[PDB]
Amino acid sequence: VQLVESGGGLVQPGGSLRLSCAVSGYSITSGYSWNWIRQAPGKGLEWVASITYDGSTNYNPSVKGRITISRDDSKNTFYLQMNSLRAEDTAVYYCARGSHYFGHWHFAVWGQGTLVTVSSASTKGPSVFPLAPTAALGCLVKDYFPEPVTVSWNSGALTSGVHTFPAVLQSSGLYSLSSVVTVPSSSLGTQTYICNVNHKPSNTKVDKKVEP
Amino acid sequence: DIQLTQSPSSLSASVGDRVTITCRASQSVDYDGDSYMNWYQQKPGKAPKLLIYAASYLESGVPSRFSGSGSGTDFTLTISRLRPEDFATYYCQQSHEDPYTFGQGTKVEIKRTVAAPSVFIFPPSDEQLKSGTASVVCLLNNFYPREAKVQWKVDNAPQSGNSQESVTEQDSKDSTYSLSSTLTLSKADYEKHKVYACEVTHQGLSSPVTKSFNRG
């Protein structure tokens, strides 16, 4: 079973978030609880809402009043809406499925989370530049907003020796990151190295060949 | 709400070590003979993974080096022999009373021997310079411990205020870190100078290591 969240990205302060979690279609949802749990950047985990098979909801009083959880079993999907968004609401939002222990719940299955960024700024896609060449080579992914960017190498075939650095917030208010890989220097004239960069908020997908 | 306090907030332990972390709840999480405390592992960038439910039961498939114990207010998670991939933040979580609540996490870092970095310097690409800015990058690869100093020099003059650094989370196989330092200048300013150098200090290096290039 897989849980896949959608609806993340930028939201204006005072606006509404609308997230969804799609669950593998083969799975039956009735013997479980369905939850949203969030994690602000650098902080711990906060449970915010749950729903059970009969539509019964439960909310954390920390946000109760501006949150609603709902379900559409015809699409095996659950939803979260929050209104009146503020800075405390910037976080990765995870959907999680609870299983029973003697009438109580534990979160045995989690989605991979979606980042919601509460901001009045515009989305901006990155530029991608080579860090040309044990040898080291890489790609610099500059000036994007909001997070996140993902990088892979050679479509995921090159993983050993890859280091993708955490993004840094520049004085411009835009992020930058680099991804580097160390490879055998002899392999350089013979093997192609392509960094695959994805910034889904700006629909940016770049495959940049890094040559010597 | 029930508050969960974990101890210690962070620890460093070597590969093979027995690691114990504690969670104290502000009231008992027992009901009718069982204790409603769960534990999760969260590796950087990933969602949490359930390890232990109801204080002491291992979720099926979790490695047997993980175990939990406790009752009432007091709970422990033990890793009997730590592996490098066990670097993570570990959270306890109570399911006894709504709202369900988590501890603040304990970060487990792997201790290992000191390793000096290897250092690489990258000039700005011509594609970036065409766009008006120059990013010069200095890479420190696979070193331990995390603490390191990088000083930029431009035609020998020490720089400050025009660089930013980023460090990886600890590596899950070799327990090292890598660090990038980026110096950012306009194209015009970059083209006024010849020698760009980064000077690195680290415990594993008896004297600082400089890497440099001549523009062009």
Author numbering:
A (entry chain H): 2 to 134, 143 to 221
B (entry chain L): 1 to 216
Original authors' sentences:
Immunoglobulin E (IgE) plays a central role in the allergic response, in which cross-linking of allergen by Fc∊RI-bound IgE triggers mast cell and basophil degranulation and the release of inflammatory mediators.
We created two omalizumab-derived Fabs, namely FabXol2, with Ser81Arg and Gln83Arg mutations, and FabXol3, which additionally contains a Leu158Pro mutation. To understand the effects of the Ser81Arg and Gln83Arg (VL) mutations on Fab crystal packing interactions, we solved the structures of FabXol2 and FabXol3 alone. Both FabXol2 and FabXol3 crystallized in the same crystal form, with one Fab molecule in the asymmetric unit. With the exception of the light-chain residue 158, which is leucine in FabXol2 and proline in FabXol3, the structures are otherwise essentially identical. As the overall structures of FabXol2 and FabXol3 are similar, further discussion will be limited to the FabXol3 structure, which was solved at higher resolution (1.45 Å for FabXol3 compared with 2.05 Å for FabXol2). The FabXol3 CDRH1 and CDRH3 conformations are markedly different to those in the FabXol, scFvXol and FabXol1 structures; the nature and implications of these conformational differences are discussed later. Engineering the Ser81Arg and Gln83Arg mutations in the VL domain of the omalizumab Fab clearly disrupted the interactions seen in the FabXol structure, but these residues also formed new packing interactions in the FabXol2 and FabXol3 structures that were seen when these molecules were crystallized alone.
